[model samples]
Target: SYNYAEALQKAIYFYECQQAGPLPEWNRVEWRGDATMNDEVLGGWYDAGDHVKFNLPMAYSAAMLGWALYEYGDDIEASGQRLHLERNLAFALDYLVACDRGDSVVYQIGDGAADHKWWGSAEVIEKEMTRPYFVGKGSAVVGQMAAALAVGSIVLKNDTYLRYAKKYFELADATRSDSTYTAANGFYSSHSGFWDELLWASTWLYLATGDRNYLDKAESYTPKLNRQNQTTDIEYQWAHCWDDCHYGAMILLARATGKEEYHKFAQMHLDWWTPQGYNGKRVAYTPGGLAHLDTWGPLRYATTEAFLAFVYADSINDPALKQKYYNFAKSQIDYALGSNPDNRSYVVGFGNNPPQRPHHRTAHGTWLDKRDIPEKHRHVLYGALVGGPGRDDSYEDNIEDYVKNEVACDYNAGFVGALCRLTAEYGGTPLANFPPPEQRDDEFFVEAAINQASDHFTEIKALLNNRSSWPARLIKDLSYNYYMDLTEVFEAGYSVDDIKVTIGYCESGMDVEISPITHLYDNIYYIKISYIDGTNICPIGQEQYAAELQFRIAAPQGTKFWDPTNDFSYQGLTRELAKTKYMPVFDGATKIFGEVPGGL
Candidate 1:
């Protein structure tokens, strides 16, 4: 029951980390690697688990993500923050446009030989060797790239994306004539034919352009495609991965043509994975009901399957079948969001106890040096659907447990898409069995405001105080409330620093002191601030603002200024005084704010 809006935003946040270099200003990582291809190829995402820009998976992630926005755009509209999705999709599409030149395309940037050798953050890749780029001669990579751009063009209605999509399609079709054209990239090499990619690309191309030639081209391959072939499997396909485009093709056909045959064909493929369906028994589900296909990341397959089920369900005209498919999708997704025996969420930031040390390079952040601790990963990999539970349904939460902890872009693509549906439409019983977010102390405000406060108050606290001994002090009324306890670590999970708060003198302000002067708890600090001195108040005009006492705390090295008054403030003095959103107040030593007044 996490907010789908935040989940989608966080997945995009992780993508920012995965972006290639000559980095964007918003790119959070400090050590962006040297510009590869001399800035020629710099904007697509790294494939997965590692930092290589393999276009097969990169393009697939973009296509599915764009498709999600295309299909459930209304849901996104209701959820709001439409620009974030559009901007990020544009980011991926722009790179694909750059990599494609009418005749050929650079499918792989950053040589795996060298990329795999370096183990640190992409920010600080100090390797002196030049990164090699791979040009595609095969139809698969070229087709996927074309598909991404085409879907992007349709979704975003961008003329540039459409132009590039058409150019890529023409080039890929031309490349298809050379039957011997193949990929030398060891990681994403296609062992099978390019018929699946061609069909997949043609279907999306038709959807994007509304030209019947592309649709006709897609349908032409239907009969010749093998049901059991790895590329065009009809039965329980194990991995919905870079190699398989059969399911995608089925989905596109069902949606595009609205034909019953395409619909039934899609059902047959989905039924293969459902418990009541023909190939139902093929997936070896865990004791806790997770579809544990292999020891390898099971959530990846589950998310993909759920997305297919949800998409197919939405496309169908029959109410009963649609409900069945929706149910199947919800069950699969709920299992990943913590419905198992242990009841831990597979996604990184949602569950009661999610993985901290994902086998991700950038998520480890500055804390990689002392990673022995289970929670040492300095940054939380929000919205990342991690490699999931073991065959026995056992999951290790430790950061080093990459088998259960790693995350990738593809893992989130389908999950986010399906979750977009679940958030907007799945109105069934909430995950009551899953552990609910812990109760907070404030019931005075509605849940959203409380949640807003809980999520951002720590940043506000850090922003309120600067390292200079002169702390921002507050004066409040004693009748309703005298001492507003500025607790360092609120039960709401907001914690930053152990502040030394000194409530300095003011003319109308009486003596002030913080509680537990001995520093009873390292995580908790309290301030006893007196706003009203017995009968002695400041001048009436200035009393409202001047009764504020002086105070300061040493804001450690790196600090950010967050105002509850602006974006994050909820039901508090911050909300009352919110005139500005946020600002970079100062570096560690610079005194940022002074005499910050608080509530009554």
Candidate 2:
């Protein structure tokens, strides 16, 4: 087994990258679709395998790193560790509280007419999307947000995050069964190429909240899940052509039941605790016993497959099971972290499994090489391609390719989460450890609740002082740990009227948020928020302060404004299949420099 110090070092490296700054903005597309009319119009979601991108990844990353910092503490390097944890945790909370209006759900993403939606938070993880609906992607966001928020609680010991997490959890639970959806199926219907995704999200909700109904709903799928296409005579297995996302839901559900039969059944697909041999030496990184994408599909660690191996190992205490699962996981990571192409450098990574595509050729079919670990030490997969072009200032080359790495939010979240999870439980070689790296909730995340809650959202009030090439953006009118960069904003000419804001600040080891606002400007027009009364959960003080009016603005008279992009009202996105106004308090926003009511 590899040494814990080395593995911890690798994990901390990812955590550092996880905390680095310059979060992606909403409505960003890597490849631009050019009509022959402009034959050479290149740039927009290009080359990126699944080029369309969103913010879910940011949210997940924020949660992952935030929780890691809180649980493990940044004592390892102390470098940017604290800031990383503060930023990611705060950022994730902002994303969970704030949402893109384009997608018509609590979870949101930018859609500049191309119809792509993503994480209600992208500053933390890089999740892009082509589908539409709060039900499908939204469902996933619900669980993710809850999980992220849980991390905040762990790191900061704040309960305010709990409310936000529960809200999303409930919202997602409600949205899952909707039917009016166009792009994704309603929580009610299972009609798509990847029905497993729906169930996957459902599992998160169940895990986070510990709601009986969630388990009941999950249990209801017994008939559909077990015999989707199982042949009685042969060993039981999930539906064949179905996507692999199904494994997370099925395995967790079976584990919770404590039925050896269920566990055995699920393992049949993932190789549950089977000993590695017959050329599969230390395949801990490989998802065993599970059917391959095809008979011999290239192993895809990026998918949730490895998750199964880790969980299966955790569920069982048998030394053999642990060894097999550990090997399954370690071998795979070992494969990815091949000979270290950049020996002198710190980058180590893997493109895919097999190291050579002898069988499958799906663009996803990649094999690990002796030297594939990222040289730049970037944990994000394929950010270059989907992040933007090399020429674009927004694009940062942290890895070999760009977004071409295909390190989607789910994969990154899973990878980092699994790494830490294993480290905590096993104490060494991830493969030998079998049972993942972290907390009980983090184990399989079967609980549907936020783990750690960070009060870092207390930093937004200071944002008005931030001045960069980008103009000052208004979030919720100002109050909380959200980021308040006013570098270019004016402090002498601003006013607020009963408004609250939350923003996903930055992606570092952990998320930090700073929010500040006052019902009164200059002690004049001391308008009080009608809601939240004294019961308001807003925090106060330092970078973690929940409420503070850090900037004052006085806009010039007579400024007309129009929301061409709908930044405030979610850009005109309203409840789907209905004409009701958004449920959130401040539905529309119009800001002039740092003043909200200054322009209309």
Candidate 3:
């Protein structure tokens, strides 16, 4: 099976790269842009493809991310990513605390009109136009933000953020008036009413604080969710997402409280979402197997469904039911990985041929002026999972394919956490913890035969930022060695020859060549620097951010990587050779100028 451990780690790193305010302490990605709102308003993540930040979805993203860590921090520690995870969780909580100013919360940062006018970097956001702070006096923003704070407070054990969370819970529940907070510049017009948002927030608060009153407040709005959704034989709620929390509130309540009434309502949604339920019929699947209900951001719905399925399934004791829910999540993730008809991984920089063009500003930008952009080139957004193919599974790698190629913060949020839950249960490389990869997900072995491709997305980034360049060489050599040694007694398997590993940023003419010289001692391999240059075309201050490379193997095109017992009995093997701790500092030729005063 594909290495789930590294993939999940990469997804977390991507979110770290997308941070807003002063960078986190372990910030490997370069920090740019100055957000001068008080401490609370400064540090949340950008909401979508655009640079503009919206509180509704931003807080929702935080809640999901924080909740995942809360539930699976043990697995996170097992995977060797606890420090990064803990720091990131603290970073987000710090921002929400700053946003909750006791009186009113700042709901947004960038001007929608100004942000939409140009496709550029957040570093230069202020130079274009003033990014005004938009305050929401409404309950929706307050409640959602409060929920994020509450979850964060529980996960972090920080009394400061918890205090703000409690204060905002009071602020949101007490506000009896209605306000949408929809500005003309950029309106996140809510699909659900403010009370539903309040109910959803209160549910999380109840779980966070364990205060029965909060649970009682959530139950009071149970009828509202049931009223708006179905009463009997309930189908999945279309309004459930980062914006609508009715489904989330129900599931949380059912798990927290031992009420059969709450359990039935939660089970209704679980049933509808999976093929085992009626909503499976309601939501149509593409010819390639992707659920096609929400056309705009279909994968977002699918990933969120996967997260909920894993969560709900884990809470149950039935082996059959748990396996069913895990299978449902597996199919959705597999579709994104390359199981679809087109076999294109919907996530950028994963699998055989990932999307080159994402509707992102920083990915498109380079040290060169926009006017000087030569023939369109590919940007290696390592962990950026893009919007997926059409209903028929049609996809393209073109840069202009925004509909199916755009990458957003919210899109990656759910799947990353869901994958974490799966990884926690099934754990793999990076650390030799837990069960085998095949035993983790339901469809792991079923699809491993078809989904064989090296996940260089994360390592390639690590290499690009590597100063010595040996880390990149080390990974490439170990991978090559694994194939060479394993295939020596070939049994009708595909060859690893002709597979070239390249390293260079798409936005520049610079290139580097490191051919393996010989084995040093144990696993480390010496390198021969055949060619290298930077040409000063790298993005300013991001000397290695835009770098990329490619590799291949898995279910090799028209052949299998290996065969099994009695011509059909195959004992699977994991791709552990690619996981290396050798991180190098990549000092391209640009360092010559960086040493000069006022370097460009």
Candidate 4:
């Protein structure tokens, strides 16, 4: 048995973790900060671990949250999570509403290739490159947005949400095409087609507005749905996913209209998921009792179907059928919460031996643009339901195993609703203070090595790195000081001018500037190396995370005036690159790392 209430609370918190742009005051994730604020449209959850905001899944997740609140708000309120769920749903709903540009909606933001190319936190992604948003009139995308806002209007009771829901629904109905939805081709291509979205949106609109036209439109679109291979029946093989909501729409229609056909269609789908096959055909189940729907996120498909099963079972009057569906729902949820042979939780931060290394860039909190560098996740991505095991119950918590370990907004969407339903029947206490303060590590610092050493001069190789993870940020005026004790130079009767500072090498395209040697004290002098475009040095790639430069502070040649052993910055440096605190780093005038002269 699992604490379903706590799981519900954490599932809602996972949405908060996925939030982008200016975060709200209520957001409890201390490590996440304002990111991607420069986007054409701000305020949307990053689709998954990566920063790209795909509107299809983004809207689907929001709608699922709204549906959860609509179905079990009173029950979720008993667990003290209704408000948290409401706020999280509204954040996404607001973004969907904002996406409306009258003629076309912004379907996707951030290039999928670029977003997935670099492995780093979300806060500093802007420094990598300017993200471009795709504007289109794709019916599938617009229809999903309409469905999310429609559900929000009912649950949140916001008239603005209702207004946009109607407008977007009409736009989607008019377009009836996904030609402009080209950008998300490889990532989230519309495989099941736009008919399902039209049916799904119309069903929600009918519930939101109580209009007969929407209901009639929804019923009319039923025949156009993708068929079950060479047959007249609707496709029942695939699970209700972001790609196809017709399965869910039919379930909702069964309750809304109570027609014999709608009821039959709904039962056909649910029965297939259960142990008792419908027409001797059932979803493949693992030996561990997980309903393995597909290789990619089998848990996502199973848990989502669990929500649908619970909803349909609750609405019906059949005693035996109700028990059967309820048992099926419980079994899938339990498998995810650790009812398997391995006895491991598929969720990231819950249950017995839960997943630790989810394939999420921001949650991984990599400073070196490498997934395996941290060895362990720097932050706990609470409430994230990771992609689950294979058909044979094979699984691993590897960060590189994107197929099995990746966590996404859509992945957790339907799973949240199932948690609420389970919490209603079996109560569990919510955490008193959730998302506890995270431990921070050194982000901005320097690594150094002696590039070349001689008595005449002390040549050093320095790398000013931005490994920020406490809300990873960018510093435009980034610079670090190389402090040297000039007692030997003064003893040699040479002034600061005589101690020439020469840059042997600097990372190209960084526009690095070496400031003239300046006096810090009577016997101490420092040369400040500043990056004119410090933001260029981001945590995107191996070469981009740090600025490398070979600089030498010299005295007159052939004079033994250089005594590097006593230099403040040259203390720990050797032939090998090592992290050194002797050289202080600064963001403009503020000291961010190490000690400056007299702590200035």
The TM-score that candidate 1 achieves is 0.67
lDDT of 1 by residue, 284-341 (tens): 7777877666676689888778888888887777898888777777787888887778
Q: lDDT per residue, candidate 2, 1-600, as tens digits?
A: 334333443333332222212332321212111111111111111111222223344445555455345434534332222443354356445555554233334333323233222111112112113333232334544445555565565566567665665555555555663243333222112333223334544454455557777667666544444343446522233321112345555666676667665665565655522343323422232222222222111223322344456656777778976777666665543323331222111112222221111100011111111112212211122211121111111112232342323323333344443444445544543223221221211000000111112221111122111110011111234222111222122233433421334333332222233224432222322111211221121111122112223222222334222111222212222222221121122212322132232223
Give the winner by lDDT: 4
Top-TM-score structure, candidate number = 4
- Tens digit of lDDT per residue, candidate 3, span 1-600? 455666676667666656776665566553233332333367777766567777777777778777777777777666676566667767766777777555677778877776766554555444345777777656777777788888887787778877887787788778844373765223566656567677877777777778888888988876554362435433345635666777766667778886787677666666666665654445667877777666677887788788877777878787987888788878887777677787667776566677767776654543322412423422345567787777777777666666777677677777777777767766755533311221111100011121233321111221232111100111111111111222321344433342233433333443545553334343222232322543222233334323333222232334433322211101232333222212112233222101111113
Backbone clash numbers for all candidates listed: 12, 163, 11, 0
lDDT of each: 0.59, 0.34, 0.58, 0.90
| C-alpha TM-score for every candidate | 0.67, 0.43, 0.68, 0.96
Better of 1 and 3 by lDDT: 1
Preferred candidate (TM-score higher): 1 or 2: 1
lDDT of 4 by residue, 297-329 (tens): 999999999999999999999999899999999
- Model 2 segments more than 4 A misplaced: 1-90, 100-106, 112-158, 177-214, 224-246, 272-304, 339-404, 421-600
Worst 10 residues of 4 by lDDT: 591-600
